[PDB]
Design a protein around this ligand. Structure first.
Ligand SMILES: CCCCCCCC/C=C\CCCCCCCC(=O)OC[C@H](COP(=O)(O)OCC[N+](C)(C)C)OC(=O)CCCCCCC/C=C\CCCCCCCC
Ligand SMILES: CCCCCCCC/C=C\CCCCCCCC(=O)OC[C@H](COP(=O)(O)OCC[N+](C)(C)C)OC(=O)CCCCCCC/C=C\CCCCCCCC
Ligand SMILES: CCCCCCCC/C=C\CCCCCCCC(=O)OC[C@H](COP(=O)(O)OCC[N+](C)(C)C)OC(=O)CCCCCCC/C=C\CCCCCCCC
Ligand SMILES: CCCCCCCCCCCCCCCCCC(=O)OC[C@H](COP(=O)(O)OC[C@H](N)C(=O)O)OC(=O)CCCCCCCCCCCCCCCCC
Ligand SMILES: COCC(CCO[C@H]1CC[C@@]2(C)C(=CC[C@H]3[C@@H]4C[C@@H]5O[C@]6(CC[C@@H](C)CO6)[C@@H](C)[C@@H]5[C@@]4(C)CC[C@@H]32)C1)COC
Ligand SMILES: CC(C)CCC[C@@H](C)[C@H]1CC[C@H]2[C@@H]3CC=C4C[C@@H](OC(=O)CCC(=O)O)CC[C@]4(C)[C@H]3CC[C@]12C
Ligand SMILES: CC(C)CCC[C@@H](C)[C@H]1CC[C@H]2[C@@H]3CC=C4C[C@@H](OC(=O)CCC(=O)O)CC[C@]4(C)[C@H]3CC[C@]12C
Ligand SMILES: CC(C)CCC[C@@H](C)[C@H]1CC[C@H]2[C@@H]3CC=C4C[C@@H](OC(=O)CCC(=O)O)CC[C@]4(C)[C@H]3CC[C@]12C
Ligand SMILES: CCCCCCCCCCCCCCCCCCOC[C@@H](O)COP(=O)(O)OCC[N+](C)(C)C
Ligand SMILES: CCCCCCCCCCCCCCCCCCOC[C@@H](O)COP(=O)(O)OCC[N+](C)(C)C
Ligand SMILES: CCCCCCCCCCCCCCCCCCOC[C@@H](O)COP(=O)(O)OCC[N+](C)(C)C
Ligand SMILES: CCCCCCCCCCCCCCCCCCOC[C@@H](O)COP(=O)(O)OCC[N+](C)(C)C
Ligand SMILES: CCCCCCCCCCCCCCCCCCOC[C@@H](O)COP(=O)(O)OCC[N+](C)(C)C
Ligand SMILES: *[C@@H]1O[C@H](CO)[C@@H](O[C@@H]2O[C@H](CO)[C@@H](O)[C@H](O)[C@H]2NC(C)=O)[C@H](O)[C@H]1NC(C)=O
Ligand SMILES: *[C@@H]1O[C@H](CO)[C@@H](O[C@@H]2O[C@H](CO)[C@@H](O)[C@H](O)[C@H]2NC(C)=O)[C@H](O)[C@H]1NC(C)=O
Ligand SMILES: CCCCCCCCCCCCC/C=C/[C@@H](O)[C@H](COP(=O)(O)O)NC(C)=O
Ligand SMILES: *[C@@H]1O[C@H](CO)[C@@H](O)[C@H](O)[C@H]1NC(C)=O
Ligand code: NA
Length: 1268
């Protein structure tokens, strides 16, 4: 009981030695609430005042027998030691031991350690430490020695059982202190790096961090199977890309204009440097890489006079290659993370042909889309079950816990403040303020600036008046009692500080919008999430901040001097690049960018200056650990808040009274106005009704729509030359229109006007036939070349939409997407206003500053030393012709352009040139300077954290809640599966969960008996598995440029492997006696061995009978079938692959709809952008001139990769960039682009594709939760 409090005495020590004597004469877990480091049970009451900081005997009966004693704080936390003297000298009663306990057992000691640690972290971030910091370093070493020595004196070193080194966290202290004195007593980067380990001590000293890091480790522990699958899949696809693309990125066009007997070999002998490479090969302007080339008809066709020859290095400094298995693995990992993969995709297609788009499609679907889903689902399950355990433990803990003139003036003015009118007036003024500050733009006249300024003066007037009036209406002591009032006070007093006599300060007016949270339910949820970011979940956010700090400082210490000294090898003018790790801030930015998803481009430079190894380990550590922590935080916010939600408001009072008033006047004026004052037709009906419902009509009509939609794809820029096909297409178009008109008439007659017109699908078909009629009559009358009718032409691209109602897959998927529109619209409004705040802030900061004065020959901004003003560039234009004062196309000149720039930043596409213009901006009409505004990166960091991370978190939560609501409103069935797919899906459930088959019969024949016993055993299976892994290795051994001897060797080893696997299959045939074919995996074995032999014969036929290397490489892929068999044994890999097989139907439906959307946008893009100028992505190979070339671009940007590069040439609309009078083969003129259609096209596309792929994400992840 509570009485069990007694001092630790030497008499008690005698008692201890004697009862341990008893236990030794004759010769239980520790309590879950009595272990050290937490709070003592409340049943024992409070401590005697003479007992704090004094040794006590252990309360646990299990620990009452061994050597131990407990010590308490004033904070009443418990620490336990062992009774054995420290190192066998310091008895627990010496002066040293209890002074060490007193110092160690204290809150002030821990606080001192925390402050000195954080000061040390502040001192780590010094690029060039001043010489005087040595003494400060010695000081820190002194405090760390003091704290260590206190721990040894209080606990011993290792002699006992509970002592200094027993817990792992003290090992870090020991290592750092011994390494500090090692460097003190005795590759400066190597020594200076290991001091970052003290930054890890915050995890030990700040409370709660221990459990957070333990939780992260436990979450990792579950990723074993998924990491094995990831390695397996990346290796298999790396071998596939090895076989297909080995050496193609070596192709370069070579100038045939070489004279004086210099042939290809005569130059081969002398190609070692890069200057001679630039002398003889083709380098597109502004590129460090030689332009690729190919041999197929669909590859990169070299210019005239250039021959395409595979010589020289691979692109990107050598690092983009599918030559050796390591480089292929790097490429497939860059494809799985979709990091700048839209450049590898373009190079691979340019050098190998547009026909490996299928390779990239299957890699993107399987590599990126699926493995990431698996990772997210497993981490989510880990966190969810851990959270359930925590909640259940907390609940159990709760159950155990339970078991004169001024006064009348003030009250009258307070009455002037009534909830209905004052609050709504203030809300309206807030909304008008935000809509009034949104009228700022760069080209502005004094009139409009003046009205803006006076309006802002008025609004700050009303808000200050409100603040003073609520100051005096209710006592200032009580004004501050609520958070909203103090928030508003801070806003007002800061706006007055503005009115005293800064650009960032101009915009904190915008925060008063958030006061709308009380009325608006969904904005309040964003407030809740941002609050959890620092509230219930502040420890995890603090872990994340600490890790980003440590990675930044580690990378800086390792690579700063490397970046500085080897600067000339990553930049041509021999100055530091834009992204570097020379400073703490720039290394922080690189770490942040890697956390955003951008890691290949900076690692190329890292490895250029600091060598491959360290760069790879450090970058992959950052990737894995940082992405782990960020994903954990995101999932925690999501689950916590959307399971959290799982006096009347002042606006509600206003609605009440205003409804009272409006209803009162409405019905009283209502009272005022009352007081002041045929068998044949229905035969046709039935016959048509069975006609339209008859199956052949439906199938014919679906075929008809498919044919019209397909005919849409031929009208490309080569339809003039195809004389025959043109006539067929136009005649067919007429027939299609007539058929659909007849279909509409038949359905009209058969169903009736109301029935046909109460259905939305018929509304779609009706609008389409209407526009076809319009264009038909306009063609007949002769007004074909009128512009509006020429535009109604392009609307023929909407024809594929007729298919949505005929196939049930996109019908059900569209039903779900439509059921989700309201919630999507609420979230979109919240995001719209949030990004509106950020867009007005960006317009205040940057509007009109992105202008610059350039050499148009190379695009080089002039030095700001000369030509620093706009007038200076105009003078230069006057004196030198080819000079331009150009602005960025996507900029912050107004709130629309601000929202386009924010959309580019939030998806990290095009965002870099935006930030370079931001940080280099000086002021309006002044030329930008290199990182003049260096700390404007923080605007983008804050926008990415808030408008991107948190809004996406809110969107995901609302979508998940909406989809589970739909699933419950359907009774618990699936929402992307038709009836037949549900039936199949249940069937494949039954197949997968099959009870094991009965044991195979035992053959009677004796030699059959021996072979059967041999083959049917574990050892045979393990032997085959080891052989398959060995064959995998001998496949990875292949490289590019290998000598013929190694080729023959690997050929023979592969032959041997085919021999042994054929032997295994033959012994299986003989021993199981056609029962081989019963078990499913043996059919796969059979197919693998057959295709292995057939491919091995066919290839050797190819190099001797029909010599074509491409077909050779395609058939030689049958080797890869052998590798597939490793999934035979792994019980987790199968489960995951069976999850994929389970989820395939829903993905088929969603991908069908996505494909139809891509088809529609491809027809539109061919109609509109087929003649835009070739700039920044639109080139000879990647354009909208053909259906293939359009759908290639649309697949590229279905992942939103590089859409900023396709949109850029369309934004050209004027003669300085584009050219509006240029003869074209369509009959039109100009290679120009109109921005409005381009912006609508790309923004819409990325939004619809985002919605659809998020739907795929939800389907797959819920499938994984269901199966597991
Ligand atoms: C928590 C812990 C996180 C993980 C930490 C460790 C993770 C990965 C560490 C991998 C370390 C690999 C070290 C390779 C050392 C090396 O230097 O090896 C040399 C080879 C061959 O060099 P070369 O002859 O081509 O020189 C080319 C010259 N040039 C290209 C300029 C023309 O270079 C190469 O193969 C480069 C091979 C890189 C292959 C991709 C590595 C795996 C990537 C992701 C795995 C998942 C994470
Ligand atoms: C149904 C659901 C809809 C959801 C989205 C609604 C968004 C609503 C926001 C804005 C729409 C209206 C904006 C105002 C439009 C009129 C602007 C105007 O009158 O003209 C001024 C500027 C052009 O300036 P200029 O002619 O002097 O320069 C000449 C440039 N030269 C050389 C190319 C000719 O006009 C411009 O270009 C403005 C160009 C940008 C237009 C807005 C961009 C929208 C992008 C993203 C919005 C969605 C974000 C994503 C949210 C979900 C994730
Ligand atoms: C580059 C590589 C190019 C070379 C690749 C070569 C091989 C590619 C395709 C060959 C496929 C050969 C046939 C594959 C399916 C074999 C089969 O017959 O599959 C049967 C199963 C259902 O039978 P069961 O396993 O329940 O039989 C009862 C036995 N019990 C219940 C105890 C497990 O159907 C299923 O799962 C179907 C699952 C099919 C997945 C095919 C993926 C191939 C990639
Ligand atoms: O329900 C739709 C109704 C009833 O079905 P139905 O079309 O007669 O079915 C015909 C088919 N051969 C069959 O019986 O299997 O379809 C009808 O036959 C009702 C009228 C359809 C349109 C006829 C023209 C009148 C205009 C619509 C008037 C509807 C009422 C609108 C005013 C209502 C005011 C209260
Ligand atoms: C407390 O008990 C709750 C239980 C119901 C549990 O339902 C779960 C269904 C799976 C689901 C929706 C849940 C939590 C984490 C969710 C994952 C977090 C990741 O977030 C994402 C999207 C957002 C990205 C930023 C990160 O990845 C998804 C890929 C991943 C995710 C959305 C896949 C789906 C997961 C809730 C009922 O108990 C009675
Ligand atoms: C739902 C919320 C988040 C947005 C509501 C729409 C408006 C409040 C915003 C969005 C687009 C903004 C407009 C973007 C473009 C312009 C053009 C601008 O005038 C010019 O650029 C003239 C240029 C010239 O004369 O050369 C004036 C501000 C204005 C109207 C902005 C006013 C504020 C607008 C209309
Ligand atoms: C904030 C600045 C940039 C002006 C932007 C426009 C807003 C004033 C509009 C857009 C969204 C509208 C809100 C949409 C949703 C709501 C919630 C509505 O109340 C509920 O929905 C209660 C639901 C429930 O209790 O379950 C009150 C109106 C309100 C705040 C609307 C108020 C007017 C809003 C905020
Ligand atoms: C010709 C161009 C210039 C303008 C075209 C405008 C139409 C696209 C608008 C006007 C009437 C609207 C329709 C009004 C009625 C309906 C029925 C509605 O379905 C129902 O109401 C079902 C009700 C039920 O089942 O109980 C679906 C939307 C729809 C097709 C609307 C779709 C959009 C329509 C066709
Ligand atoms: C599955 C259907 C889902 C709905 C999809 C909409 C209808 C889908 C109808 O598909 C037809 C397209 O495949 C036609 O494309 P083509 O390859 O014929 O065009 C190339 C012509 N050139 C390039 C030779 C000139
Ligand atoms: C330039 C102009 C661009 C215009 C683009 C227009 C795109 C429009 C897309 C509309 C996309 C089609 O609209 C979907 C609605 O028809 C949904 O239909 P319902 O769910 O009401 O029908 C019931 C079906 N069940 C419930 C029986 C299964
Ligand atoms: C790419 C690889 C794709 C692999 C796809 C494999 C699909 C594998 C689909 O398996 C289908 C079986 O389960 C059907 O078995 P039953 O005939 O018993 O079920 C009948 C159900 N009906 C008749 C009612 C519909
Ligand atoms: C970011 C991720 C973007 C992904 C873009 C590419 C996605 C590509 C998504 O397409 C996946 C579907 O085509 C797979 O379905 P199957 O081809 O197996 O069709 C058979 C389905 N049954 C046979 C079971 C019905
Ligand atoms: C989910 C859907 C994912 C994308 C699906 C796209 C399917 C496939 C439709 O995309 C068209 C691509 O195949 C174009 O590549 P081609 O092989 O046609 O290019 C060669 C053309 N010439 C130069 C030989 C004539
Ligand atoms: C803009 O750049 C171009 C090319 O970079 C300059 O034109 C020539 O540049 C070369 C450098 O390789 C000089 O040797 C020539 O003398 C330049 N020719 C002329 C006519 O200038 C051009 O000078 C640059 N513009 C300005 C204003 O300096
Ligand atoms: C912007 O242009 C120049 C760029 O330095 C500014 O400086 C003037 O330059 C002219 C021509 O070199 C000199 O004659 C003047 O003496 C410079 N000004 C001064 C104060 O020395 C010029 O002032 C700027 N003009 C505007 C309108 O901003
Ligand atoms: C008619 C329906 C309109 C729907 C509009 C879309 C609503 C979106 C609301 C949430 C906004 C999320 C903003 C986040 C940006 C992402 O694109 C990023 C994605 O970056 P990631 O690929 O996750 O690194
Ligand atoms: C071949 O190259 C040599 C250079 O040593 C040159 O003298 C000779 O004329 C060349 N032959 C022809 C046919 O151009
Ligand atoms: Na990159």
């Amino acid at each position: 009981g509570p009485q069990s409090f007694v001092h630790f005495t030497k008499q008690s020590l005698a008692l201890i030695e004697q009862r341990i004597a008893e236990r030794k004469s004759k010769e239980p877990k520790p309590s879950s609430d009595l272990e050290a480091g937490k709070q003592l049970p409340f049943i024992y009451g409070d401590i005697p005042p003479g007992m704090v900081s004094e040794p006590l005997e252990d309360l646990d009966p299990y620990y009452a027998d061994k050597k131990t004693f407990i010590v308490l704080n004033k904070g009443k936390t418990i620490f336990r030691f062992n009774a054995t003297p420290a190192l066998y000298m310091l008895s627990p009663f010496s002066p040293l031991r209890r002074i060490s306990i007193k110092i160690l057992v204290h809150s002030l000691f821990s606080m001192l350690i925390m402050c000195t640690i954080l000061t040390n972290c502040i001192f780590m971030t010094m690029n060039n430490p001043p010489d005087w910091t040595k003494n400060v370093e010695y000081t820190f070493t002194g405090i760390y020695t003091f704290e260590s020595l206190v721990k040894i004196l209080a606990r011993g070193f290792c002699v006992g059982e509970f002592t200094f080194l027993r817990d792992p966290w003290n090992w870090l202290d020991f290592v750092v202190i011994v390494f500090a004195y090692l460097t003190e007593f005795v590759n400066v980067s190597a020594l200076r790096t290991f001091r970052v380990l003290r930054a890890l001590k915050t995890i030990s000293v700040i409370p709660g961090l221990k459990t957070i890091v333990g939780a992260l480790i436990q979450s990792v522990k579950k990723l074993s199977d998924v990491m094995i699958l990831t390695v397996f899949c990346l290796s298999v696809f790396a071998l596939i890309g090895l076989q297909l693309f080995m050496g193609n990125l070596k192709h370069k066009c070579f100038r045939n204009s070489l004279e004086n007997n210099e042939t290809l070999e005569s130059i081969m002998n002398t190609l070692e440097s890069e200057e001679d490479f630039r002398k003889y090969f083709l380098y597109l302007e502004g590129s460090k890489d030689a332009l690729l080339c190919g041999f197929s008809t669909d590859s990169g066709q070299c210019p005239e006079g250039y021959t395409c020859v595979k010589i020289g290095r691979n692109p990107d400094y050598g690092y983009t290659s599918f030559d050796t298995f390591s480089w292929a693995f790097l490429a497939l990992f860059r494809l799985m993370t979709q990091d700048y993969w839209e450049r590898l995709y373009q190079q691979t297609l340019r050098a190998a042909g547009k026909t490996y788009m299928i390779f990239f499609v299957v890699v993107i679907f399987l590599g990126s889309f699926y493995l990431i889903n698996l990772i997210l689902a497993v981490v989510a399950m880990a966190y969810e079950e851990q959270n359930q355990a925590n909640i259940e433990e907390a609940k159990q803990k709760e159950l155990e816990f339970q078991q004169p003139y001024w006064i009348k003036f003030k009250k009258c003015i307070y009455f002037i403040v009534m909830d209905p009118f004052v609050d709504l007036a203030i809300t309206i003024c807030i909304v008008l303020n935000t809509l009034f500050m949104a009228m700022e733009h760069h080209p502005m006249t004094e009139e409009f600036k003046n009205v803006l300024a006076i309006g802002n003066l008025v609004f700050t007037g009303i808000f200050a008046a409100e603040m003073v009036l609520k100051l005096i209406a209710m006592d200032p002591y009580e004004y501050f009692q609520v958070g909203w009032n103090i928030f508003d006070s801070l806003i007002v007093t800061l706006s007055l500080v503005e009115l005293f006599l800064l650009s960032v300060l101009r915009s904190f007016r915008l925060l008063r919008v958030f006061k709308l949270a009380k009325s608006w339910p969904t904005l309040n949820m964003l407030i809740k999430i941002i609050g959890n970011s620092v509230g219930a979940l502040g420890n995890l956010t603090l872990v994340l901040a600490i890790i980003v700090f440590i990675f930044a400082v580690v990378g800086m210490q390792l690579f700063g001097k490397s970046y500085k000294e080897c600067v000339c090898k990553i930049n041509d003018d021999c100055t530091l690049p834009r992204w570097h790790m020379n400073d703490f801030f720039h290394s922080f930015l690189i770490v942040f960018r890697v956390l955003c998803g951008e890691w290949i481009e900076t690692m190329w430079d890292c490895m250029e200056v600091a060598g491959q190894a360290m760069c790879l380990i450090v970058y992959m550590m950052v990737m894995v650990i940082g992405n782990l922590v960020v994903l954990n935080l995101f999932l925690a916010l999501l689950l916590s808040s959307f399971s959290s939600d799982n006096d009347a408001n002042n606006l509600q009072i206003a609605v009440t009274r205003i409804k009272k008033g409006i209803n009162y006047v409405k019905q009283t004026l209502r009272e005022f106005i009352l007081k002041a004052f045929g068998k044949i037709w229905w035969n046709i009906r039935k016959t048509c009704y069975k006609i339209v419902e008859h199956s052949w009509f439906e199938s014919f009509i679906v075929l008809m729509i498919l044919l019209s939609s397909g005919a849409l794809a031929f009208e490309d820029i080569y339809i003039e030359r195809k004389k025959t096909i043109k006539i067929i297409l136009e005649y067919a178009d007429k027939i299609f229109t007539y058929i659909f008109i007849l279909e509409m008439l038949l359905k009209w007659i058969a169903y009736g006007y109301k029935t046909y017109f109460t259905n939305a699908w018929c509304w779609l078909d009706f609008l389409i036939v209407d526009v076809s009629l319009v264009t038909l009559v306009a063609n007949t009358l002769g007004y074909s070349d009128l512009g509006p009718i020429k535009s109604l032409r392009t609307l023929r691209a909407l024809r594929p939409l007729r298919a949505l109602s005929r196939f049930e897959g996109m019908r059900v998927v569209v039903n779900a997407l439509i059921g989700a529109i309201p919630s999507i619209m609420n979230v979109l409004l919240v995001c719209l206003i949030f990004w509106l705040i950020f867009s007005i802030m960006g317009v205040n900061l940057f509007a009109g500053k992105f202008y610059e004065c350039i050499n148009t020959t190379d695009g080089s901004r002039f030095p700001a030393s000369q030509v620093p003003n706009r007038s200076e560039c105009f003078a230069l234009m006057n004196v030198s012709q080819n000079v331009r004062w150009k602005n960025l196309k996507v900029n912050f000149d107004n709130v629309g352009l601000g929202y386009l720039s924010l959309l580019q930043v939030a998806t990290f596409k095009g965002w870099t040139i935006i930030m370079y213009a931001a940080v280099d901006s000086v002021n309006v009409d002044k030329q930008p300077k290199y990182e003049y505004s260096l700390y404007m990166y923080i605007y983008f960091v804050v926008f990415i954290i808030f408008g991107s991370f948190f809004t996406l978190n809110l969107f995901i939560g609302v979508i998940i809640d909406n989809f589970n609501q739909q699933k419950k409103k359907l009774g618990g069935q699936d929402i992307f599966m038709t009836e037949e797919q549900k039936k199949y899906y249940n069937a494949m459930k039954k197949l997968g969960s099959k009870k094991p088959q009965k044991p195979i019969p035992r053959p009677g024949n004796k030699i059959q008996g021996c072979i059967f016993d041999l083959v049917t055993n574990q050892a045979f299976d393990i032997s085959i598995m080891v052989l398959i892994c060995l064959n995998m290795v001998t496949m990875m051994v292949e490289k590019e440029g290998q000598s013929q001897h190694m080729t023959e060797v690997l050929y023979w080893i592969n032959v041997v492997f085919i021999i042994l696997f054929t032997g295994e299959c033959v012994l299986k045939l003989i021993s199981l006696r056609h029962y081989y074919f019963t078990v499913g995996w043996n059919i796969f074995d059979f197919v693998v061995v057959i295709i292995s032999i057939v491919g091995m014969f066919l290839a050797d036929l190819i190099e001797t009978y029909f010599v074509s290397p491409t077909l050779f490489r395609v058939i030689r892929l049958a080797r890869i079938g052998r590798i597939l068999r490793l999934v035979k044994g792994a019980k987790g890999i199968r489960t995951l692959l069976f999850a994929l097989m389970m989820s395939l139907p829903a993905l088929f439906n969603i991908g069908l709809l996505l494909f139809l959307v891509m088809f529609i946008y491809a027809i539109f893009g061919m109609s509109n952008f087929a003649y835009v100028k070739w700039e920044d992505g639109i080139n000879d190979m990647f354009n909208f001139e053909t259906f293939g070339n359009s759908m290639i671009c649309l697949f590229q940007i279905t992942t939103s990769a590089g859409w900023d590069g396709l949109l850029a040439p369309i934004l050209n609309s004027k003669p300085p960039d584009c050219d509006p009078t240029l003869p074209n083969s369509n009959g039109s003129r100009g290679d120009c682009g109109n921005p409005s259609v381009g912006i609508f096209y790309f923004v819409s596309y990325i939004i619809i594709s985002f919605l659809v792929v998020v739907n795929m994400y939800i389907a797959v992840i819920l499938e994984n939760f269901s199966v597991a």
